[PDB]
Ligand SMILES: CCCCCCCCCCCCCCCCCC(=O)OC[C@H](COP(=O)([O-])OCC(O)COP(=O)([O-])OC[C@@H](COC(=O)CCCCCCCCCCCCCCCCC)OC(=O)CCCCCCCCCCCCCCCCC)OC(=O)CCCCCCCCCCCCCCCCC
């Protein structure tokens with residue numbers, strides 16, 4: 001990164017830990033939380049990487065950086081699946097029509113049984129890839145699949161733990 | 165589906181009763197401020213006979229009565245205009 | 251009727267405070283000021299699809315197709 | 320001879336839902352609406368489907384929409400008149416069959432608030448009940464009687480629009496019940512989690528939740544108190560607190576949880 | 579309608595699919611850019627706007643009050659309206 | 661009774677002094693065309709037709725007669741008003757198109773909520789920009805008054 | 819083989835309370851003010 005600012009290892013540790021908990025604490029399910037925050041997170045993450053490059057092997061800073069990277073990876077991956085679920089549910093809502101009447105109704109997803117098989121596979125892939133972020137995966141993608149289940153009757157492993 | 169006690173119909177009558185009075189007053193105040201300015205800039209002045217009035221005007225302003233097209237815009241409105249106006 | 255000086259600081263400052271106070275209050279204090287955020291959050295947020303046709307995309311697309319890009 | 324129009328949907332035919340009119344003699348029927356529905360099922364049309372257990376208003380299973388306003392059929396009274404009594408499922412809910420709604424989202428949202436007492440120190444051996452004064456117990460009076468009927472939920476215009484993001488009146492009142500329980504020691508954690516634009520501040524004070532509550536509770540008042548407490552007690556470090564609790568739930572099973 | 583069935587979902591922060599969340603972030607930037615540009619309207623009004631009755635005002639100051647120190651005898655009735 | 665609308669005194673002077681016709685520029689033409697019509701329940705304000713007449717006359721730029729100077733000042737104030745009307749249409753067009761493209765993937769409700777307000781805001785912004793670039797913000801109170809004097813006035817006998 | 823139904827908008831039938839109509843009049847307050855300004859602007863431009 002192009003910068004002339006210099007930071008101590010203590011300052012570098014503080015910045016990295018602040019960003020890690022900020023990301024892990026923010027509610028990922030609300031889209032506006034990620035849309036508004038990610039621009040600020042990306043600017044900070046670039047600065048954190050530059051100042052923590054010497055301390056990648058450090059016993060304290062190193063683990064923080066590794067967790068921070070993993071959290072950002074999980075944040076982007078989970079947001080992608082829930083974005084597609086939101087697309088499916090909004091296609092379904094538009095199909096209901098104006099006022100629910102069906103008056104000016106859009107055409108209704110035809111491969112919905114198959115689009116629900118795609119999402120559930122993605123959900124399970126996230127669970128395996130990010131084993132230490134299940135609480136966040138369930139907050140975003142898990143709950144998203146529970147909403148879809150109310151529209152289409154499909155089977156996924158955690159369906160019973162979502163009251164289905 | 166449709167009911168009189170519905171949230172839609174009761175929120176549409178409530179809004180009308182609540183806002184239409186406020187609005188009528190608000191627009192009226194603007195209309196009143198408009199009249200106050202208009203009556204101070206060109207107050208409508210009523211003349212008895214249009215033909216006599218037109219003559220006094222042409223005489224007072226030094227305008228040739230032949231070059232002025234007088235037209236009746238409405239039952240209670242006449243209008244003198246320049247006939248040689250670009 | 252012919253004072254040597256006229257005191258204007260008090261009156262002008264009073265008007266400044268009143269005008270500034272009303273404008274700053276309206277812009278900062280009321281929660282109504284976030285009414286446009288609430289309406290958008292309630293009815294507009296998380297209600298979008300890329301798999302549904304809309305006129306602006308159709309218009310841009312046809313006009314491009316017409317001009318051979 | 321009252322007329323009862325009832326919403327009907329077959330999950331298999333998947334034909335457009337319709338209102339079917341039945342005629343019942345109130346002389347041979349119980350005063351409550353649920354009695355009329357049972358009589359219709361027993362005599363005329365046994366296909367009619369509806370949830371009912373307690374018959375006394377306590378289970379919270381007979382929540383329906385009667386003549387426009389949500390309520391429990393077992394506590395609702397039949398009001399005879401020329402106008403047919405219209406009975407429909409809970410508003411803006413997915414209908415599994417006839418008058419049986421789909422309240423799975425409501426159950427999931429409740430599991431999210433983690434409604435179980437949390438303490439930093441495990442009960443020491445040889446310890447009796449955790450101390451609570453009568454006055455402290457009085458604070459939890461109007462909040463612990465909620466039967467989860469879900470009427471207040473399906474009466475909020477804000478839950479109609481954003482069901483999957485707004486926790487809803489009932490869940491929010493239950494969250495205040497655990498934020499107000501002197502014995503709970505995770506007050507700050509609960510307030511930090513609930514302090515979200517979508518979860519809490521989607522309540523615009525319509526007051527439909529309090530008007531339709533069958534148990535006479537006031538979910539609207541509780542949400543107002545919870546918003547005032549959060550605003551006064553907010554600190555910059557709350558976000559970190561939420562993150563740390565999320566790390567503590569890392570090994571939890573697959574279901575809604577604090578995160 | 580129908581929907582694509584072979585979507586390659588994002589796997590990490592450096593292998594990302596273009597979705598409507600990223601489009602929404604571009605919208606945030608573009609709307610915020612408009613706000614920066616529209617600030618030039620109110621700022622330009624305050625800078626370029628002059629409240630003067632005629633061209634006389636400046637001539638009066640050049641010939642009677644050049645230093646902005648000359649003191650005028652005050653006749654209250656003039657501007658008091660009475 | 662009967663009313664009589666006659667050319668105002670400013671109109672009389674402008675007609676006496678006009679030396680020739682004056683070419684209307686392209687922006688003046690468009691500005692007049694894009695100007696909303698005015699319904700004269702009572703006559704107190706200038707409309708697009710009166711403004712054209714003012715702009716179609718020509719006056720001697722050197723003439724030192726005080727009367728001619730008033731006419732030229734008025735014609736300049738009318739010109740700034742007319743060319744300022746060219747900014748409303750650009751504003752309203754961009755005030756609908758840009759928001760609509762941005763919300764093109766969102767539901768109908770969102771376009772109904774947003775587009776009407778952005779349209780008025782864009783039109784207002786365009787009007788501000790047009791009046792600003794037409795030098796209306798630097799006009800004196802004497803210039804603006806002379807440009808707003810009515811062209812038709814009810815006759816007052818005696 | 820089985821599918822659930824989605825009930826129509828509740829606005830058309832749900833009973834209206836006086837606190838719910840008045841809460842709307844509050845959320846629509848700024849919308850009316852803009853409307854009135856537009857009317858006055860239009861009148862100042864197309865009338866008298
Ligand atoms: C009539 C003329 C106006 C017509 C409308 C003009 C519209 C164009 C405006 C252009 C300027 C920029 C506007 C904001 C851009 C976005 C900024 C942003 O993203 O910030 C986070 C933004 C909120 O910003 P915030 O600054 O943190 O909080 C705002 C609060 O005001 C708290 O902020 P505060 O503490 O600084 O409080 C100051 C408050 C002070 O508040 C006021 O001035 C009071 C009036 C408030 C209500 C006014 C509108 C009433 C009509 C209905 C409004 C709702 C419908 C939509 C309206 C247009 C929205 C653009 O000022 C504001 O509200 C913020 C300034 C801009 C307001 C623009 C809209 C209203 C202009 C009204 C002017 C005339 C009002 C007259 C009222 C009557 C009496 C005279 O949140 C969201 O983006 C939520 C989105 C939810 C849905 C998903 C949308 C997609 C998500 C991806 C990004 C999208 C970006 C674009 C969003 C808008 C799309 C239409």
Ligand SMILES: CCCCCCCCCCCCCCCCCC(=O)OC[C@H](COP(=O)([O-])OCC[N+](C)(C)C)OC(=O)CCCCCCCCCCCCCCCCC
Nearest residue numbers: 260263264265266267268269271272273656657658659660
């Ligand atoms: C140190 C102590 C500080 C105390 C601060 C107190 C602040 C609060 C009190 C108000 C101060 C500001 C008053 C307004 C500005 C001064 C007056 C002014 O400009 O008018 C004279 C101007 C003077 O113009 P003029 O051209 O007529 O003056 C010539 C007068 N003659 C003919 C007699 C010579 O008035 C007008 O032009 C007429 C219209 C006046 C319209 C006033 C509208 C309301 C203004 C107040 C709004 C308050 C909003 C917030 C409160 C809630 C409102 C509902």
Ligand SMILES: COC1=C(OC)C(=O)C(CC=C(C)C)=C(C)C1=O
Nearest residue numbers: 098099100293479480769826827829
């Ligand atoms: C059934 O279709 C409709 C919605 O979906 C639930 C709405 O969100 C809303 C609420 C939001 C707006 C802006 C109309 C209504 C009224 C509507 O008709």
Ligand code: SF4
Nearest residue numbers: 465466467468471532
């Ligand atoms: S608050 Fe009232 S209506 Fe809501 S679940 Fe509890 S008892 Fe039922």
Ligand code: F3S
Nearest residue numbers: 475522523526527528
């Ligand atoms: S009706 Fe809904 S908006 Fe709040 S006051 Fe009750 S939960």
Ligand code: FES
Nearest residue numbers: 373374378379393
């Ligand atoms: S049957 Fe239990 S609440 Fe009515």
Ligand SMILES: [K+]
Nearest residue numbers: 498500503506
């Ligand atoms: K507690």
